[PDB]
Each structure stands twice: as C-alpha cells, then as structure tokens.
Amino acid sequence: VGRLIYTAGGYFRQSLSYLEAYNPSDGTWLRLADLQVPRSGLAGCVVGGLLYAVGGRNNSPDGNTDSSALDCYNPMTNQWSPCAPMSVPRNRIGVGVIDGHIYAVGGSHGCIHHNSVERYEPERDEWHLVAPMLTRRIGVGVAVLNRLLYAVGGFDGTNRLNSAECYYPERNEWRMITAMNTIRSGAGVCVLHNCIYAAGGYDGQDQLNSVERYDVATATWTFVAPMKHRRSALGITVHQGRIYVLGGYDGHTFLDSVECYDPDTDTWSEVTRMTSGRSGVGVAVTMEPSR
Ligand SMILES: [Cl-]
Ligand SMILES: [Cl-]
Ligand code: NA
Ligand code: NA
Ligand code: NA
C-alpha cells in the first residue's frame, strides 16, 4: 500500500486542527479528521502504522495553553483517539522513536524550559520519565540513528544552541557530541541514509536556509545544499529516500512551500504548496487511509 506525508496541527494567526496528507506521486492533499484540540509546536511520529500527535500548545482567541496531550490517529478508521498524557506540557517539543517507544524531548511550559525527557510505551499506554538532557532545549530537533536518540539545537531560554547530545537508552545517560556548524532553534531534524540532517531554523538574528548533516562515523557536521526558502518552525520528514520540509516562518510570512531534498543529486526542489501557510506542524509518514 502507498504511504502519504501527514501534517497535523500548526499555527497561522491561531493554532490549527488540520490533519492533511500529501501524496507525492499524484500531488493531492487529502483532508482528514481534525485534531480534537488545535495545536501548534507539536511533533508527529508513527509507531505500528498509527500516527501520534505529541505536545504543543493551543493558541486561541479565548486563551493559550501548552499541551501535555498524546493523541493517536488510525488511517484505517480516520479516527483520533486520546492516549495517556505526558507528565508535563511541552510546547515546541521534539520526539523520536526507538524500539516501538516514543521519546518526548524538551519543549516549554510557560516560562519553564525543559531538559526533562520521557518515554511512552504504546503496549501499556504509559509514560515514564528518563534521564534529563544536559541542556534545556525548546524548539529542539530530534532524530534516531542506530537506536541512539539525538537532541539537536534548540533554545535554552536565553541562548539558541548549536550543541547536540546523544541519549543511550540502556545506559540511561546523555553525552554531548560535536556541535553543529550553525546555531539553530526550530530546525527540522531527521535521519536519512544513516546521517542526521538539520535544516533551517532560527539563530536569534535570521531564519536559516542552510542544511547540515552529521556522520556518526566521522563525528562531523558537513553543510549540504541549502533550501530555497529560509524557514524556522518547519516540519520535516523522510519519504522514499528523500527529505520533505513543510511550511515554517521566514520572518514575514507563514509559508505553504514544501521542498524536497534529493540526496543523490544534493538538490532541493519545491514540489507542492500546502492548502494554507502555517508553521509549527507535526509531520510523519504512514499508510494512506482506507475508504
Ligand atoms: Cl475548516
Ligand atoms: Cl514532527
Ligand atoms: Na517528529
Ligand atoms: Na486555536
Ligand atoms: Na525558532
């Protein structure tokens, strides 16, 4: 069965409830069941074919609230179902999946900038706290490489960060690694062909279009081709060997641009436009819905 790029939530004037899924072959955007609660600054991931929306914040004209929620979308039913929530609300969260468990990393709750990390077990619908990061990180990018969890960049409440650190699940321990060339908060971070990519973000002066890639073998970050559009708070995912970046904010506009990175040619190209511009979406890939 074919797989689609799902985008959940996001922000434009207020937090959004949209769930839409892009088909890179036929170009369509499918409109699917709304999130129960509008949320921006959330993360998406997929475990066992189910799409999970984690954390975020409901910015609404009636009031704003960070979210601890975990919700699960089933493409086979086009229905959302709530899960047990996290221990704390986490706006501008990063997540990664290791051995079928969801790791929720960093984020903010009001003025609290989290270094804490917690792990979700779907088979028991339970969260448990694990060792905290060495650094408080909101707008942190998260990727998993060889069953290690990497936390990249972010904002500690005062400084934006180029530092990255690595979580060893069986040691329950974080270790600093080589820092990125570029300070980035709200970057898109993902894994492609055994490398971690960090694309875009904000360094406290400019939104960024540069992209760099970490090689665990050489413990080095290297720049690759930059994106066409500078963007912070972008969504990112991998589909059939290519990176997709969705939306974001460029200092002036909430973007609807979607760009696609081909690693074999080291080229970015714009492939579609979202039905409306937005930042702060959660993005992941899974099977197309049934009908
Ligand atoms: Cl609507
Ligand atoms: Cl995401
Ligand atoms: Na994610
Ligand atoms: Na809202
Ligand atoms: Na940012």
Curated annotation (Swiss-Prot):
Changing R92A: Loss of interaction with NFE2L2/NRF2. Abolishes repression of NFE2L2/NRF2-dependent gene expression. Loss of interaction with PGAM5. Does not affect interaction with SQSTM1/p62. It is found in: Cytoplasm; Nucleus. Changing F155A: Abolishes repression of NFE2L2/NRF2-dependent gene expression. Kelch repeats lie at residues 4-49, 50-100, 101-147, 148-194, 195-241, 242-288. The modification S-cGMP-cysteine is found at C111. Changing G41C: In a lung adenocarcinoma cell line; also in NSCLC cell lines; strongly reduces interaction with NFE2L2/NRF2 and reduces repression of NFE2L2/NRF2-dependent gene expression. The modification S-(2-succinyl)cysteine is found at S290. Substrate-specific adapter of a BCR (BTB-CUL3-RBX1) E3 ubiquitin ligase complex that regulates the response to oxidative stress by targeting NFE2L2/NRF2 for ubiquitination. KEAP1 acts as a key sensor of oxidative and electrophilic stress: in normal conditions, the BCR(KEAP1) complex mediates ubiquitination and degradation of NFE2L2/NRF2, a transcription factor regulating expression of many cytoprotective genes. This is Kelch-like ECH-associated protein 1. The gene is KEAP1.
